[PDB]
Design a protein around this nucleic acid. Structure first.
Lengths: 279, 313
DNA sequence: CGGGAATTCCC
DNA sequence: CGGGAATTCCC
């Protein structure tokens, strides 16, 4: 027995999106799709399944927490057809691809701002899963929210139906440092021997001195260079000693791309070309 | 030639944090240019040509051509309302100011603080035309402390509390010492001519902190310049910083060269990737003993010189 | 009792 | 927008 439902045919870029404060209004950088990549910019989309016979559906994108207690999240999705944390778009299949939410944007609140907003939210009747009344605030992440899509329709007689809620892949803030995509701007030099112990400077983007590592890669190889937290200068320049390569004496050098990797969630930069040499 | 105040040890000037209100004043104590490693030295002044007991107070005045009240506030033991009142003079006429803290009002809550400061001052002496508006003075202390005063004037300070907030620079301040001698009845009412200290720059101000060349890449480069070097350093403003290499040739002059880099080659204010400049003499073979130092085009403040070596081709 | 770094506000 | 100044918070 088939029942209408919607699905996320494209999650929102899990990382790279910067949240904005009320005091900044909108911006030219909206939420992207998992795919994307500067050449083919994609937008987070959904689709309605087995919805024929439904003259028109209505979907409502609205951030919610992230884990088990999926209470309405303080921040709010700003953009087209929105108003409060809830971008709405009426729909009639005979298309049904659900656009993909184009300019969609997140507008973060302030660590103090919470309680109110989140409270003024349910007060306003916005809660995809319903929280409660006794204390709706504890440890809230202002750096990771999650889009929750919903859909509903009437039938013959007004009585509307609500097709089960759909969560999205967790979205992280680009400024929350610990939760941003790591990257390596420059790098001291790309030559260097194969032995190791070669001091190599590395100008990277924002990263915490107590949770950052750099690993040189190869054939299923993963050697990580050593360096103490006292080497990481103001989270923007990691300085390290070059590690050794899988015991080799070969005269023909090889590509051993390196990259930043977070000890917290393993996430990591986009590799950077560096090759060893002989003894 | 008569009784007069005098600063003995001026405040440090650079390298002290104007801890914000929300930070909680309990953070440190403003030192004097000397307070060294294992030998502290605070800001102290001495009353001269007078050996009886006294009262020496201190407050924060703006920096620059004009001398008005600053919105920031001093904090400490014998302090209150941004004005520390130490006594001193029974037999010893020197007094120091230990654990002095410098508030730091938010650029927003300035005015209110000023207006409140000015007005409250429009009831006593030394604080009249010298402070608020040089068009009053009609105050300079009456006899009992006149009340809040009437409008117009109550609007003259407000109008001044405005023109001033606008031109107040919260990243710098000067301490103002004012000694009061005892005029009969033992009371302290003989107010000696005040003295202003040197400027004190907030180390949290990107435009005026200490410069430091924390470990850089290469400690030497070819005399052919064009040497791209990675430099790690303390906060800088790409647009106003420079890397000055230099040599003091034997009483014949003073050589100096500057590295190359676009305000883009400065990484998030702490790193600068530059290209070394051509030395003074290139055809030479003997290595060159030179010095490099970050420098602010604005204030000409300069970091510690780190030895650099120029090697020929 | 200092200093680093995270959060906000601004250009 | 992304870089930095302004203000906080946290160890």
């Amino acid at each position: 027995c088939p029942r209408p439902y919607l699905v996320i045919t494209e999650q929102p870029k899990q990382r790279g999106m910067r949240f904005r404060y009320e005091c900044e209004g909108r911006s030219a950088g909206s939420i992207l799709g998992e795919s994307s990549t500067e050449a083919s910019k994609t937008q987070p989309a959904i689709e309605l399944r087995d919805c024929g016979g439904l003259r028109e559906v209505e979907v409502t994108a609205c951030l919610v927490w992230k884990d088990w207690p999926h209470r309405v999240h303080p921040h709010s999705l700003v953009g087209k057809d929105c108003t409060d944390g809830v971008c709405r778009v009426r729909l009639r299949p005979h298309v049904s691809p659900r656009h993909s939410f184009n300019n969609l944007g997140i507008q973060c609140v302030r660590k103090k701002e919470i309680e109110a907003a989140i409270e003024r939210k349910i007060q306003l009747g916005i809660d995809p899963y319903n929280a409660g009344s006794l204390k709706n605030h504890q440890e809230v992440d202002m750096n990771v929210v999650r889009i929750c899509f919903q859909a509903s329709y009437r039938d013959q007689q007004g009585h509307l139906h609500r097709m089960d809620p759909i969560l999205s892949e967790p979205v992280y803030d680009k400024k929350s440092t610990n939760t941003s995509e790591l990257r390596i701007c420059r790098i001291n030099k790309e030559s260097g021997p194969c032995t190791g112990g070669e001091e190599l400077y590395l100008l990277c983007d924002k990263v915490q001195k107590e949770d950052i590592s750099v690993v040189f890669s190869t054939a299923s190889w993963e050697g990580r260079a050593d360096f103490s937290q006292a080497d990481v200068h103001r989270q923007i320049a990691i300085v390290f000693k070059t590690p050794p390569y899988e015991d080799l004496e070969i005269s023909e050098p090889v590509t051993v791309n390196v990259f930043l990797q977070r000890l917290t969630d393993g996430v990591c930069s986009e590799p950077l070309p560096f090759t060893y040499l002989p003894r | 030639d008569g009784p007069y105040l005098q600063i003995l040890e001026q405040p440090k000037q650079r390298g002290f944090r104007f801890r914000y209100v929300c930070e909680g004043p309990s953070h440190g104590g403003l030192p004097g240019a000397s307070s060294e490693k294992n030998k502290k030295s605070y800001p102290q002044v001495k009353i001269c040509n007078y050996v009886g007991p006294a009262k020496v107070i201190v407050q924060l005045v703006t920096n620059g051509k004009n001398i008005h009240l600053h919105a920031h506030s001093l904090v400490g033991k014998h302090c209150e309302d941004g004005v520390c009142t130490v006594t001193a003079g029974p037999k010893d006429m020197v007094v120091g100011f230990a654990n002095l803290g410098i508030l730091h009002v938010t650029k927003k809550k300035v005015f209110e603080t000023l207006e409140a400061r000015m007005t409250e001052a429009c009831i006593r002496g030394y604080n009249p035309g010298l402070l608020v508006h040089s068009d009053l003075a009609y105050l300079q202390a009456e006899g009992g402390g006149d009340r809040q005063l009437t409008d117009r004037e109550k609007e003259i300070i407000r109008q001044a509390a405005v023109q001033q907030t606008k031109e107040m620079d919260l990243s710098v301040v000067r301490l103002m010492f004012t000694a009061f001698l005892p005029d009969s009845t033992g009371s302290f009412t003989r107010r000696l001519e005040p003295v202003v200290s040197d400027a004190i720059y907030d180390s949290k101000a990107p435009n005026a902190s200490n410069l430091k060349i924390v470990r850089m890449d290469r400690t030497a480069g070819c005399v052919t310049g064009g040497e791209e070097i990675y430099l790690l350093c303390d906060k800088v403003q790409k647009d106003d910083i420079q890397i000055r290499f230099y040599e003091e040739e034997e009483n014949g002059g003073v050589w100096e060269g500057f590295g190359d880099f676009s305000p883009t080659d400065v990484h998030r204010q702490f790193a600068i990737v530059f290209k070394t400049p051509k030395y003074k003499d290139v055809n030479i073979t003997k290595p060159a003993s030179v010095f490099v130092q970050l420098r602010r085009k604005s204030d000409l403040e300069t970091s510690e010189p780190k030895p650099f070596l120029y090697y020929p081709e």
